[PDB]
Design a protein around this ligand. Structure first.
Ligand code: ANP
Length: 480
């Protein structure tokens, strides 16, 4: 077939390369053993076709399908001799590693062939000098210490500076989101959804008929209300001012509706951020008034934000939280981009959209009795149980708080390593949520600090270490 395409790529039969290019054949094309044509071309320093391929639009940053002679021989189930003569004659005869070549970009092989020209060609085509192969080796790793290495490392510094400027203006362009991300542990997707919705309304791409309306689905004690207040303080800049919370359970009867119709709280601020808790179990009339608020635009307020919460669909969301995290982090990845493509994949119906219209809305609808009611919401937000790292970070937040307080009041330095956190994480019970952590730290640590300070065993200016001795587990405080 087009084996001759990369035999040409391997021998630099340029007139044939153009030919097949004209027939629309893809440059990314690989061998039966897995190397891209650009790889063979780069390895044998056949620049005319390297140049042409980087012209055609061949991807430089494509990893090799080939691993080792032994390995590929075991995978594709062949004699080691077949595989060997193949890799040797159809690719290169200078490579010595019995290690795996899986994930080597053309830049890798370029450094391995020790030629500056194809390195330069690959770099000019925006190849990654930091792309790691399965081992973790950059092409710089495999570079002889030439000025080739200087070229490649300066490339590294360039790509680095690019990353850094990119960070700087993800900060400049999405400040609310930076604020949420730096004041809230975990819950990536939630922040993304909420912030994006907010500036979606600010820029004017919602029907500015009625203020923002959110529904926070998920579990107790994982950031819902916290996120809400955070948003509030970002908008009104007064921590106190912009925020309203209604405990819905209080309302379950028709007399509660007379009370509900808040009117004064709204009067203090039209523009504030309002939250309802466990909204699923509250009077339908209360919601209809709530929906009337959510449609009307008296009900004076306009530029307000409306948030609702439920433990409803909690179990369902929980049952599978992986594809939600994946999707969330994918969105963050696609956000720091700047071309019409990236936006076009913003067109796509993301798995979350399928997730609302398959499993969630039916349950949401049945509990709610109104098609209209699911219609009224600007956005539905999901909240996830913390992964390990996030729990660690919560504990960390706690210890940092107490260390800080100690250092100002009594000038005491509180210290610890990772094990302490790893142990206190084992004190996280779900039913209370992040506070659970609050408890543990205040129990296993602050009790001890208070006890010691009472007894005058903490002298002003001392230094302490939180340690774990297994003798079953006990946490011990010591003075250094
Ligand atoms: N991601 C989080 N980041 C930081 N603090 C959190 C986080 N999640 C919960 N907390 C802490 O928990 C406290 C409030 O709990 P919170 O998560 O806001 O309640 P909730 O999830 O909305 N459910 P509920 O208990 O009904 O209000 C805050 O003071 C936080 O310090």
């Amino acid at each position: 077939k087009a084996e001759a395409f990369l035999e040409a790529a391997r021998s630099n039969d340029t007139e044939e390369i153009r030919r097949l290019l004209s027939e629309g054949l893809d440059p990314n094309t690989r061998h039966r053993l897995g190397w891209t044509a650009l790889m063979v071309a780069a390895m044998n320093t056949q620049h005319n076709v390297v140049k042409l391929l980087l012209d055609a639009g061949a991807d430089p940053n494509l990893g090799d399908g080939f691993s080792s002679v032994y390995d590929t021989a075991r995978e594709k189930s062949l004699h080691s001799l077949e595989v060997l003569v193949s890799r040797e004659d159809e690719f290169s005869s200078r490579l010595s590693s019995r290690a795996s070549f899986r994930g080597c970009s053309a830049l890798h092989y370029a450094a391995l062939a020790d030629d500056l020209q194809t390195v330069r060609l690959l770099l000019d085509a925006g190849a990654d000098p930091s792309l790691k192969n399965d081992l973790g080796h950059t092409p710089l790793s495999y570079a002889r210490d030439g000025e080739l290495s200087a070229v490649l490392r300066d490339a590294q510094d360039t790509f680095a500076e690019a990353q850094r400027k990119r960070e700087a203006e993800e900060r400049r362009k999405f400040p609310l989101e930076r604020r949420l991300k730096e004041h809230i542990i975990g819950q990536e997707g939630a922040i993304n959804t909420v912030a994006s919705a907010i500036r979606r309304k600010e820029n004017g791409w919602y029907d500015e008929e009625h203020p923002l309306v959110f529904l926070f689905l998920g579990s107790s004690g994982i950031g819902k209300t916290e996120l809400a207040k955070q948003v509030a303080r970002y908008m009104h800049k007064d921590i106190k001012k912009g925020f309203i919370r209604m405990d819905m359970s209080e309302f379950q009867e028709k007399h509660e509706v007379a009370k509900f119709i808040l009117t004064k709280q709204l009067k203090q601020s039209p523009s504030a951020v309002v939250l309802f808790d466990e909204v699923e179990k509250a009077h339908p009339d209360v919601l209809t008034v709530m929906l009337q608020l959510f449609d009307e635009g008296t009900i004076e307020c306009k530029d307000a934000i409306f948030i609702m919460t439920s433990n409803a669909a909690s179990d369902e969301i929980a049952q599978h939280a992986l594809q939600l995290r994946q999707e969330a982090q994918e969105q963050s990845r696609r956000r720091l981009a700047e071309n019409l493509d990236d936006v076009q994949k913003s067109e796509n119906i993301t798995i979350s959209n399928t997730f609302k219209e398959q499993v969630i809305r039916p349950i949401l609808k049945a509990h709610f009795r109104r098609d209209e009611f699911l219609g009224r919401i600007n956005e539905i937000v999901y909240f996830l149980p913390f992964c390990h790292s996030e729990l660690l970070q919560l504990v960390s937040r706690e210890l940092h708080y107490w260390a800080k307080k100690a250092k100002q009041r009594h000038n005491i330095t509180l210290l610890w390593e990772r094990p302490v956190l790893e142990l206190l994480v084992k004190g996280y019970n779900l039913h209370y949520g992040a506070r659970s952590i609050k408890h543990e730290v205040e129990r296993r640590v602050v009790n001890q600090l208070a006890a010691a300070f009472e007894q005058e065993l903490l002298p002003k200016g001392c230094t302490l270490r939180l340690t774990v001795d297994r003798d079953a587990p006990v946490l011990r405080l010591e003075l250094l």
